[PDB]
């Protein structure tokens with residue numbers, strides 16, 4: 001679990017969105033595993049606008065933050081699940097690091113702010129759904 005609170009927006013993994021998220025929907029994209037819903041309170045998270053490939057992510061399964069090198073956002077294949085059929089997930093970035101079912105939603109940060117959230121993982125790898133291209137989160 002985990003979300004990004006920026007302005008009147010809440011960003012979450014689409015496969016973990018609640019009824020309130022769907023009732024206050026702004027935008028959703030299955031191929032990215034992203035859903036953005038509206039909030040009445042102002043969120044205090046800064047989004048990064050960069051091409052950083054180093055950052056720090058929160059791993060709830062270890063209650064620890066880890067530094068990682070990560071790849072450029074791309075279409076990476078993702079196996080079937082109770083949430084999605086087998087497909088290519090776009091805007092996905094991989095890093096060598098621990099993650100397990102329950103870690104989705106952990107924020108990845110660089111020196112410029114929020115880069116994205118944990119969305120995939122397995123075999124010593126962890127995938128992050130990038131949010132840096134979503135320029136409307138600040139306007």
Ligand SMILES: CSc1cncnc1CC(=O)N1CCC[C@H](C(N)=O)C1
Pocket residue numbers: 015033078081083084089099100101102103104118119120121122123
């Ligand atoms: C940190 S998530 C994780 C980690 N280690 C093993 N498995 C997982 C689960 C995992 O990869 N997915 C299940 C939920 C939907 C994900 C998707 N973005 O399509 C795929």
Ligand SMILES: [Zn+2]
Pocket residue numbers: 048049050051052110111112113
């Ligand atoms: Zn950065």
